[PDB]
């Protein structure tokens, strides 16, 4: 129904998905003129993130990105409701332009971005029900840049070889998802926004950590070159690249750090 | 169509199919998509010194302010002669005075001037040209906050007479080349589109490398003088943030400079 490229690309999402042309759209450029320090923004607590290595979690190529299913016993503590995990997934660019984060900082894209999606389990019974409702979603965003090899990210990336094509799936043994978060999680940007893909509902409480994580040049290249958005038997195969939405016009972004 | 709300830029494709098509402008000018082209030679600006005995219509059309230009103003150096039709501006707002259309290495400038031309070797007028490939050529000048600019003030001194949609004022001829920056020989060149509906992908863009300056007071005037609504409208709407977000570009921008 929708794509990141071509005639069904992001400027056309609003035809079928009205909220994509509505208010509170994400992602955004995090820059000085729209920030405000909020001393009340305390560190979140990440509970249940240490997933048992005896359990397995489904990784799927759905044609738009790769996503890992997460159990609802994982949750964020510190918001007005409990938010319980549902999935994590990534957004990236391409080897010729390896700058495919969704959020930018002072107009700069990072190489990639990880989103850990949660739903308000105090108010709603599941993520689908929560997704178009008040206070329904909370997403944690980790900016990713090129640097040292990252063994924790490789716990996902080592499986990309088995989800090359749309509709393919692989089981990933549990590991500590907190390993994917950066140093100093206390420093973050906080704002009310939306899903960054259709249906673009304006129901997401975003937390974008200030500090990026690093993955190696080779890990980033693998992420950018391993996957296809087409089924294996498609006579017109299409590489899965540039699967991020452009920044949206933006209204205040609160920061847990004063400078 | 508008730049904010239900008829804003993510909705333009609902009515204007080209706004969701290929070759859309503006774009972020950054290293990964740039290629030096030693063959790109300086444009020559012919007829830009408009007679002071003549006058040129300035119009608030509800989306920006535009100044009509005569077809005896020409650019030489492209594959055809292109003749002027108008100039106009794009800007931000006082709380976020960063409303250029093009960005450079992810940074918005305060505003941007467009001087629109059409291929007069092939087409009799800009309307005809606008639907034809490379029918149009636009010169873009990036504008930053700095010194007072007496040349731009030859346009800005009139803003208080075109405050509302449909209002018009005459501007005596002056040297339009005074609106251009230093070292016009240095520029970015790419094939793109109109940045407003109908978004036709028919524009040869030239973005000069170097910005010009206007003062904080001049920028504030440009950001606060104009309304998108008619004078008698019971709910006035300020004309601010009348720039399109940057578009995906994955394709090369050629530069006339290497360093
Ligand atoms: N970037 S984002 O964090 O906004 C965000 C989400 F949040 C959710 N998941 C949400 C919660 C679970 C499903 C219920 C409906 C809301 C989607 C999802 S999703 O898997 O559920 C797809 C449906 C929405 O397009 C995605 N995708 C986009 C397609 C590629 C994989 C990740 C997304 F990018
Ligand atoms: N940013 S841009 O340079 O792409 C660009 C153009 F080029 C043209 N003028 C072109 C040539 C003259 C008229 C023929 C049709 C194509 C528009 C125009 S225009 O006046 O002709 C309006 C066309 C609306 O469909 C505009 N506007 C947008 C609204 C505010 C004033 C300037 C524009 F922003
Ligand atoms: Zn996402
Ligand atoms: Zn313009």
Numbering used by the authors:
A (entry chain B): 3 to 252, 255 to 263
B (entry chain A): 4 to 253, 255 to 263
Relevant lines from the article:
The role of carbonic anhydrase isozyme IX (CAIX) in tumor cell survival, proliferation, migration, pH regulation, and cell-signaling pathways made this enzyme a promising therapeutic target in oncology. , Tumor cells primarily express two membrane-associated carbonic anhydrases, CAIX and CAXII. These isozymes belong to a family of zinc metalloenzymes that catalyze the reversible hydration of CO2 to form HCO3 – and H+. Although the active site is characterized by conserved amino acids between 12 isozymes, the amino acids further away from the zinc ion provide some variability. Crystal structures of CAIX and CAXII with five compounds by using soaking or cocrystallization were determined to confirm the binding mode of the ligands and reveal insights that govern enhanced affinity.
Four ligands in complexes with CAXII are of similar structures, contain a cyclooctylamine group at the 3-position and (3-hydroxypropyl)­sulfonyl tail at the 4-position, but vary in substituents at the 5-position: compound 9 has a (4-hydroxybutyl)­amino moiety, compound 10 - piperidinyl, compound 13 - methoxy, and compound 14 - ethoxy. Compound 10 with cyclic piperidinyl group retains a high affinity for CAIX (K d,obs 0.29 nM). A complex of CAXII-10 is present in structures containing two and four subunits. In all subunits, the ligand adopts a consistent binding mode, with variability in the cyclooctylamino and piperidinyl rings. Additionally, the para-tail hydroxyl group shows positional variability, as it is exposed to solvent. The meta-piperidinyl group in compound 10 is well-stabilized and tightly packed against the hydrophilic cavity wall, with all conformations being similar. Like compound 13, a water molecule is also found in a similar position and forms hydrogen bonds with Y6 and H67. However, there is no direct interaction between this meta-substituent of the ligand and the protein. The sulfoxide linker of the para-tail is stabilized by a hydrogen bond with N64 and Q89, except in CAXII-10, where N64 is too distant for interaction, but in one subunit 3.4 Å hydrogen bond is still possible. Interestingly, despite the bulkiness of synthesized di-meta-substituted compounds 10, 13, and 14, especially the first one compound 10, which possesses large piperidinyl and cyclooctylamino groups, ligands acquire quite similar binding poses in the soaked and cocrystallized complexes with CAXII.
